[PDB]
Amino acid sequence: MRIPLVGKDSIESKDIGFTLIHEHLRAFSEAVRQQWPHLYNEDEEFRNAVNEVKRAMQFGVKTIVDPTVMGCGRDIRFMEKVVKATGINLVAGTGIFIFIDLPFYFLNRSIDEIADLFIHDIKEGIQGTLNKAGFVKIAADEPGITKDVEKVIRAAAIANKETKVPIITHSNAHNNTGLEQQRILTEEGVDPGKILIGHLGDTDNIDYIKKIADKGSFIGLDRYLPVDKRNETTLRLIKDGYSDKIMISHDYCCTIDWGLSITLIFEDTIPFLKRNGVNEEVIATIFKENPKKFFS
Amino acid sequence: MRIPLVGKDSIESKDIGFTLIHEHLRAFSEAVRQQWPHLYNEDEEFRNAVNEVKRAMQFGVKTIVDPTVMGCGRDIRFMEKVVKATGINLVAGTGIFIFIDLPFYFLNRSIDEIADLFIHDIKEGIQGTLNKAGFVKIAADEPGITKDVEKVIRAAAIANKETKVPIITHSNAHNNTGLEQQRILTEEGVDPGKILIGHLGDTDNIDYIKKIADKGSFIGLDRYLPVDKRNETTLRLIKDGYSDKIMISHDYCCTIDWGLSITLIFEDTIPFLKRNGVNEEVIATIFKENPKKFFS
Ligand SMILES: [Co+2]
Ligand SMILES: [Co+2]
Ligand SMILES: [Fe+3]
Ligand SMILES: [Fe+3]
């Protein structure tokens, strides 16, 4: 008992097995789905999510971490229906995904009030259920570290200090937002090894990626920049000894509403790696050992 | 049959009666209510809304226009429950309330696609019901006319040209956003008399308010700046002959989630006006004749 699972008893982090650290069963904007439901088909979303999870399981995936949070349409009851249909271990999270400003709710509200929402989901449960959050997700992108973006980062640090759950980020690989997230969180007392700086596979600036890993945090070679170039960067990082900081995901959304699959790393990335000399222990380090330490 | 009403057959605009043009039965951020429902109490919200509507009816209000739209938690089923409990004529709208950027859904989507959402609500119905929207609501504030704010303004103009429903805006009274909204909409072909530029009672810069009214649009002396100063501005505008452009509302939210009543104009504003020489025909112009023309 250590990592909460949707629809299941919690599991020890040592038992997580082969893990996909950043996959979305579904993603959507809460406000536009509430206001224009005619744009959406939950039944198609459900079928797609179950099919994708089943395909991942066929390749040996035990556990999927789904970092859908506020702003991207987290729905714990949908998640538990997918678990019932598949038997996957599913880790849900809490957090806020914003690039610029917070919803109007947060006007005149403190960082502590924001952290209390995260702690509520970790300690009490998500959306009125007893399913608990196992990590915090935060974001920054092209607008950089705005005032509200920084509030959310600081609230994630408070939640981590109180509950010890790790932090996954979304960053923009072409600016310094990932480095800034790592800096702010570690300055606030977060263990660097409890942070995954995401979307670093989007750039080929290896020195920037290595800088973040060298500071202690996992580097998300997620969103599986052409895969060939991504693979080249991934291979380069492996060849240079960074396997124990690398996390690979697809950042695949089985259904997204914005105006490819959860097994591409099995059909393309992992075969490419293997064809270029990467052995089995590297694959196990990335997909089993790194998530075990992240959640340990 | 001309203005759609929640839970009722449509009514001719000539039969709207005494109207409150800008009141919220409820307002909230869709994403934070979806993600943290423990923060909200629908039963309290419902009781408050019914009580406020009943009090307005006791003062002679026939029709209430509720400009809650995407971003502020529009819920047509809540609205119809309030209508069932009170018998009020309630006009619901469509639109998007943003100050900076659109939800991620709208990435790579056209102004025409946005207008199609508004036209859907006006012609087909809101949120899977047969209750239709009777106006479009848009906003701009301190960030000014951003790219996404302007997209929404231009989509409102398309919806108005297709369906002839009027447009209500939120503006910031201390910058030129209201003037800019009016300019963009009229440049796109919207009749100036089909536009209410809102939140102009927030400033005492009478020349700015008069400029908008002189260009043909209604001026929202809503949000009933101290009421005394608001009343002074309202009285001044009346004394200067602007009654036939003035719309008074409270912009009262019977429940808002951000970190006073719908009858304050009956307890304070209207008595103050009357005490300062304003007669009955002015009150009738503001609250009956102006909304009739707006919706005509
Ligand atoms: Co991301
Ligand atoms: Co407003
Ligand atoms: Fe993601
Ligand atoms: Fe309002």
Side-chain angles (χ1 to χ4, degrees), chain A residues 30-61:
Chain A
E30 293 89 342
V32 0
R33 189 173 191 126
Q34 177 168 330
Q35 294 310 334
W36 293 290
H38 73 275
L39 297 174
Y40 299 83
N41 183 353
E42 172 170 35
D43 308 82
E44 182 179 28
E45 290 163 346
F46 179 69
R47 292 178 305 108
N48 286 345
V50 168
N51 284 348
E52 287 300 298
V53 167
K54 284 182 174 177
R55 298 209 299 101
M57 284 176 85
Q58 290 163 8
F59 278 108
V61 175

Tab-separated table of all heavy atoms in Angstrom, chain A residues 30-61:
chain	number	residue	atom	x	y	z
A	30	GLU	N	-13.067	21.416	-19.899
A	30	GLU	CA	-14.294	21.259	-19.119
A	30	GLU	C	-15.374	22.238	-19.551
A	30	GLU	O	-16.561	21.877	-19.601
A	30	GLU	CB	-14.022	21.452	-17.626
A	30	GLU	CG	-13.158	20.395	-16.954
A	30	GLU	CD	-11.655	20.696	-17.017
A	30	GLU	OE1	-11.196	21.522	-17.844
A	30	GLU	OE2	-10.928	20.085	-16.213
A	31	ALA	N	-15.006	23.494	-19.781
A	31	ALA	CA	-16.031	24.486	-20.078
A	31	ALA	C	-16.667	24.238	-21.434
A	31	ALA	O	-17.884	24.409	-21.597
A	31	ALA	CB	-15.441	25.886	-20.022
A	32	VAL	N	-15.885	23.838	-22.433
A	32	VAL	CA	-16.603	23.702	-23.693
A	32	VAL	C	-17.393	22.401	-23.728
A	32	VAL	O	-18.485	22.381	-24.296
A	32	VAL	CB	-15.725	24.003	-24.940
A	32	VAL	CG1	-14.281	24.393	-24.612
A	32	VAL	CG2	-15.882	22.996	-26.088
A	33	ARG	N	-16.991	21.357	-22.985
A	33	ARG	CA	-17.816	20.159	-22.934
A	33	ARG	C	-19.101	20.407	-22.154
A	33	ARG	O	-20.165	19.866	-22.512
A	33	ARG	CB	-17.034	19.009	-22.314
A	33	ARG	CG	-17.802	17.713	-22.459
A	33	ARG	CD	-16.983	16.549	-22.013
A	33	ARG	NE	-17.626	15.297	-22.391
A	33	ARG	CZ	-17.009	14.358	-23.089
A	33	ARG	NH1	-15.748	14.499	-23.463
A	33	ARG	NH2	-17.660	13.229	-23.380
A	34	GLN	N	-19.027	21.180	-21.058
A	34	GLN	CA	-20.249	21.514	-20.336
A	34	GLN	C	-21.189	22.316	-21.217
A	34	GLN	O	-22.413	22.104	-21.182
A	34	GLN	CB	-19.935	22.306	-19.066
A	34	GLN	CG	-21.221	22.725	-18.343
A	34	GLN	CD	-20.982	23.252	-16.948
A	34	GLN	OE1	-20.033	22.840	-16.279
A	34	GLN	NE2	-21.828	24.200	-16.512
A	35	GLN	N	-20.644	23.256	-22.001
A	35	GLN	CA	-21.525	24.186	-22.703
A	35	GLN	C	-22.022	23.654	-24.034
A	35	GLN	O	-23.146	24.009	-24.448
A	35	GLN	CB	-20.824	25.530	-22.924
A	35	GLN	CG	-20.522	26.276	-21.615
A	35	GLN	CD	-21.734	26.373	-20.709
A	35	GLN	OE1	-22.873	26.340	-21.176
A	35	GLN	NE2	-21.502	26.473	-19.403
A	36	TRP	N	-21.215	22.834	-24.730
A	36	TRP	CA	-21.564	22.305	-26.047
A	36	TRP	C	-21.343	20.800	-26.064
A	36	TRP	O	-20.448	20.287	-26.748
A	36	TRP	CB	-20.770	23.023	-27.138
A	36	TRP	CG	-21.205	24.457	-27.205
A	36	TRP	CD1	-22.411	24.918	-27.650
A	36	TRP	CD2	-20.470	25.606	-26.765
A	36	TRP	NE1	-22.461	26.287	-27.538
A	36	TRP	CE2	-21.284	26.736	-26.999
A	36	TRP	CE3	-19.195	25.793	-26.216
A	36	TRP	CZ2	-20.880	28.029	-26.679
A	36	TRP	CZ3	-18.789	27.080	-25.915
A	36	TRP	CH2	-19.632	28.185	-26.145
A	37	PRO	N	-22.153	20.058	-25.312
A	37	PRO	CA	-21.975	18.599	-25.278
A	37	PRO	C	-22.182	17.936	-26.622
A	37	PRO	O	-21.733	16.792	-26.797
A	37	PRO	CB	-23.022	18.133	-24.262
A	37	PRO	CG	-24.022	19.278	-24.171
A	37	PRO	CD	-23.212	20.525	-24.402
A	38	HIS	N	-22.816	18.612	-27.586
A	38	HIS	CA	-23.039	17.991	-28.888
A	38	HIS	C	-21.733	17.719	-29.619
A	38	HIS	O	-21.730	16.926	-30.572
A	38	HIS	CB	-23.959	18.867	-29.770
A	38	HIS	CG	-23.306	20.104	-30.314
A	38	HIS	ND1	-23.218	21.286	-29.610
A	38	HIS	CD2	-22.726	20.347	-31.517
A	38	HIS	CE1	-22.601	22.193	-30.345
A	38	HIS	NE2	-22.287	21.647	-31.506
A	39	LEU	N	-20.625	18.326	-29.180
A	39	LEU	CA	-19.321	18.151	-29.798
A	39	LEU	C	-18.647	16.850	-29.389
A	39	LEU	O	-17.612	16.503	-29.977
A	39	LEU	CB	-18.413	19.319	-29.405
A	39	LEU	CG	-18.836	20.715	-29.869
A	39	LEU	CD1	-17.893	21.747	-29.255
A	39	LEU	CD2	-18.891	20.867	-31.367
A	40	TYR	N	-19.173	16.150	-28.386
A	40	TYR	CA	-18.461	15.044	-27.761
A	40	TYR	C	-19.265	13.758	-27.823
A	40	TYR	O	-20.497	13.761	-27.879
A	40	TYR	CB	-18.119	15.351	-26.298
A	40	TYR	CG	-17.219	16.547	-26.162
A	40	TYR	CD1	-17.730	17.833	-26.172
A	40	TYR	CD2	-15.847	16.386	-26.103
A	40	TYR	CE1	-16.900	18.931	-26.073
A	40	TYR	CE2	-14.998	17.479	-26.001
A	40	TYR	CZ	-15.529	18.755	-25.996
A	40	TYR	OH	-14.681	19.849	-25.890
A	41	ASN	N	-18.532	12.644	-27.772
A	41	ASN	CA	-19.136	11.309	-27.775
A	41	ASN	C	-18.419	10.458	-26.731
A	41	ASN	O	-17.369	9.873	-27.024
A	41	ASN	CB	-19.056	10.696	-29.161
A	41	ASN	CG	-19.730	9.335	-29.239
A	41	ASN	OD1	-20.156	8.770	-28.227
A	41	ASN	ND2	-19.855	8.827	-30.449
A	42	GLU	N	-18.992	10.385	-25.522
A	42	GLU	CA	-18.341	9.641	-24.444
A	42	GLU	C	-18.204	8.169	-24.792
A	42	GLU	O	-17.230	7.520	-24.408
A	42	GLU	CB	-19.116	9.777	-23.138
A	42	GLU	CG	-18.569	8.867	-22.037
A	42	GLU	CD	-19.158	9.156	-20.663
A	42	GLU	OE1	-20.355	9.518	-20.591
A	42	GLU	OE2	-18.425	9.016	-19.656
A	43	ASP	N	-19.169	7.622	-25.524
A	43	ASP	CA	-19.113	6.209	-25.861
A	43	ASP	C	-17.922	5.899	-26.766
A	43	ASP	O	-17.215	4.904	-26.557
A	43	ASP	CB	-20.451	5.818	-26.485
A	43	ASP	CG	-21.636	6.238	-25.600
A	43	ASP	OD1	-22.050	7.429	-25.652
A	43	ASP	OD2	-22.153	5.372	-24.856
A	44	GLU	N	-17.659	6.751	-27.755
A	44	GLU	CA	-16.459	6.598	-28.571
A	44	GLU	C	-15.198	6.789	-27.734
A	44	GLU	O	-14.233	6.029	-27.869
A	44	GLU	CB	-16.487	7.593	-29.733
A	44	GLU	CG	-15.313	7.489	-30.680
A	44	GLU	CD	-15.390	8.471	-31.833
A	44	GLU	OE1	-15.993	9.552	-31.666
A	44	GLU	OE2	-14.843	8.157	-32.910
A	45	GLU	N	-15.200	7.794	-26.854
A	45	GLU	CA	-14.041	8.018	-25.992
A	45	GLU	C	-13.764	6.797	-25.130
A	45	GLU	O	-12.605	6.386	-24.969
A	45	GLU	CB	-14.299	9.235	-25.102
A	45	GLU	CG	-14.300	10.537	-25.861
A	45	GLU	CD	-14.957	11.672	-25.090
A	45	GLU	OE1	-15.635	11.393	-24.082
A	45	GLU	OE2	-14.792	12.842	-25.504
A	46	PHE	N	-14.815	6.206	-24.570
A	46	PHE	CA	-14.659	5.030	-23.728
A	46	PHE	C	-14.111	3.855	-24.526
A	46	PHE	O	-13.157	3.192	-24.100
A	46	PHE	CB	-16.004	4.661	-23.107
A	46	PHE	CG	-15.951	3.438	-22.247
A	46	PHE	CD1	-15.281	3.458	-21.043
A	46	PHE	CD2	-16.527	2.251	-22.670
A	46	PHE	CE1	-15.229	2.341	-20.242
A	46	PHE	CE2	-16.458	1.111	-21.879
A	46	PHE	CZ	-15.821	1.160	-20.665
A	47	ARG	N	-14.705	3.582	-25.691
A	47	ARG	CA	-14.230	2.469	-26.508
A	47	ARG	C	-12.765	2.648	-26.883
A	47	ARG	O	-11.977	1.694	-26.811
A	47	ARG	CB	-15.080	2.340	-27.772
A	47	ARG	CG	-16.503	1.901	-27.541
A	47	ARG	CD	-17.274	1.854	-28.865
A	47	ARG	NE	-17.215	3.122	-29.584
A	47	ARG	CZ	-16.517	3.326	-30.694
A	47	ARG	NH1	-15.821	2.355	-31.263
A	47	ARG	NH2	-16.509	4.537	-31.242
A	48	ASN	N	-12.380	3.870	-27.283
A	48	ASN	CA	-10.991	4.146	-27.657
A	48	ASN	C	-10.055	3.938	-26.477
A	48	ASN	O	-8.979	3.345	-26.611
A	48	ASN	CB	-10.865	5.590	-28.164
A	48	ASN	CG	-11.440	5.785	-29.545
A	48	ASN	OD1	-11.707	4.822	-30.270
A	48	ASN	ND2	-11.658	7.043	-29.916
A	49	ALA	N	-10.441	4.437	-25.310
A	49	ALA	CA	-9.586	4.289	-24.142
A	49	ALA	C	-9.414	2.826	-23.769
A	49	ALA	O	-8.302	2.385	-23.462
A	49	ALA	CB	-10.170	5.072	-22.967
A	50	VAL	N	-10.506	2.055	-23.778
A	50	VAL	CA	-10.395	0.646	-23.405
A	50	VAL	C	-9.523	-0.093	-24.412
A	50	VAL	O	-8.671	-0.910	-24.034
A	50	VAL	CB	-11.796	0.018	-23.287
A	50	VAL	CG1	-11.710	-1.517	-23.181
A	50	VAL	CG2	-12.554	0.600	-22.109
A	51	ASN	N	-9.710	0.191	-25.709
A	51	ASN	CA	-8.912	-0.471	-26.735
A	51	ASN	C	-7.439	-0.147	-26.569
A	51	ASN	O	-6.591	-1.044	-26.636
A	51	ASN	CB	-9.409	-0.074	-28.127
A	51	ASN	CG	-10.693	-0.779	-28.495
A	51	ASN	OD1	-11.105	-1.721	-27.818
A	51	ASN	ND2	-11.353	-0.309	-29.552
A	52	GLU	N	-7.113	1.122	-26.327
A	52	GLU	CA	-5.718	1.498	-26.164
A	52	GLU	C	-5.113	0.847	-24.921
A	52	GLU	O	-3.981	0.344	-24.965
A	52	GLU	CB	-5.602	3.023	-26.108
A	52	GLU	CG	-5.833	3.686	-27.479
A	52	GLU	CD	-4.841	3.231	-28.546
A	52	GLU	OE1	-3.623	3.459	-28.385
A	52	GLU	OE2	-5.282	2.630	-29.551
A	53	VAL	N	-5.846	0.840	-23.807
A	53	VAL	CA	-5.323	0.213	-22.594
A	53	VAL	C	-5.107	-1.279	-22.829
A	53	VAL	O	-4.097	-1.848	-22.396
A	53	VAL	CB	-6.269	0.465	-21.410
A	53	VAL	CG1	-5.917	-0.423	-20.226
A	53	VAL	CG2	-6.243	1.948	-21.015
A	54	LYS	N	-6.065	-1.936	-23.492
A	54	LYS	CA	-5.918	-3.362	-23.765
A	54	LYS	C	-4.696	-3.620	-24.629
A	54	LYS	O	-3.945	-4.576	-24.376
A	54	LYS	CB	-7.194	-3.901	-24.421
A	54	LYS	CG	-8.333	-4.083	-23.452
A	54	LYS	CD	-9.554	-4.676	-24.148
A	54	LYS	CE	-10.648	-5.005	-23.165
A	54	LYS	NZ	-11.864	-5.525	-23.874
A	55	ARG	N	-4.447	-2.761	-25.622
A	55	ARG	CA	-3.258	-2.953	-26.452
A	55	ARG	C	-1.980	-2.760	-25.646
A	55	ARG	O	-1.010	-3.505	-25.823
A	55	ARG	CB	-3.299	-2.021	-27.660
A	55	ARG	CG	-4.493	-2.301	-28.567
A	55	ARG	CD	-4.232	-1.956	-30.010
A	55	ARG	NE	-3.944	-0.541	-30.173
A	55	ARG	CZ	-2.725	-0.045	-30.313
A	55	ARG	NH1	-1.658	-0.827	-30.346
A	55	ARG	NH2	-2.574	1.269	-30.411
A	56	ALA	N	-1.940	-1.764	-24.760
A	56	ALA	CA	-0.769	-1.603	-23.904
A	56	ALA	C	-0.540	-2.837	-23.041
A	56	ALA	O	0.602	-3.270	-22.856
A	56	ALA	CB	-0.919	-0.356	-23.029
A	57	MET	N	-1.616	-3.422	-22.519
A	57	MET	CA	-1.501	-4.595	-21.672
A	57	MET	C	-0.951	-5.776	-22.465
A	57	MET	O	-0.207	-6.599	-21.916
A	57	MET	CB	-2.876	-4.914	-21.101
A	57	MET	CG	-3.225	-3.941	-19.970
A	57	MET	SD	-4.882	-4.172	-19.302
A	57	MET	CE	-4.578	-5.475	-18.110
A	58	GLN	N	-1.288	-5.852	-23.750
A	58	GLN	CA	-0.789	-6.937	-24.593
A	58	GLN	C	0.720	-6.856	-24.762
A	58	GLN	O	1.372	-7.885	-24.993
A	58	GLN	CB	-1.494	-6.897	-25.948
A	58	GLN	CG	-2.954	-7.289	-25.835
A	58	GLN	CD	-3.783	-6.887	-27.031
A	58	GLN	OE1	-3.259	-6.433	-28.046
A	58	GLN	NE2	-5.099	-7.023	-26.902
A	59	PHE	N	1.295	-5.656	-24.639
A	59	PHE	CA	2.733	-5.458	-24.732
A	59	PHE	C	3.428	-5.530	-23.378
A	59	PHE	O	4.637	-5.281	-23.297
A	59	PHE	CB	3.035	-4.114	-25.395
A	59	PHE	CG	2.971	-4.155	-26.896
A	59	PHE	CD1	1.919	-3.557	-27.562
A	59	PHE	CD2	3.946	-4.815	-27.643
A	59	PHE	CE1	1.840	-3.584	-28.942
A	59	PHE	CE2	3.873	-4.836	-29.030
A	59	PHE	CZ	2.814	-4.225	-29.678
A	60	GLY	N	2.706	-5.855	-22.317
A	60	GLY	CA	3.306	-6.034	-21.014
A	60	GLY	C	3.143	-4.878	-20.048
A	60	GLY	O	3.725	-4.916	-18.957
A	61	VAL	N	2.364	-3.858	-20.398
A	61	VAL	CA	2.215	-2.735	-19.479
A	61	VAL	C	1.358	-3.172	-18.303
A	61	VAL	O	0.273	-3.738	-18.489
A	61	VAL	CB	1.594	-1.532	-20.197
A	61	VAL	CG1	1.336	-0.402	-19.195
A	61	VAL	CG2	2.494	-1.057	-21.321
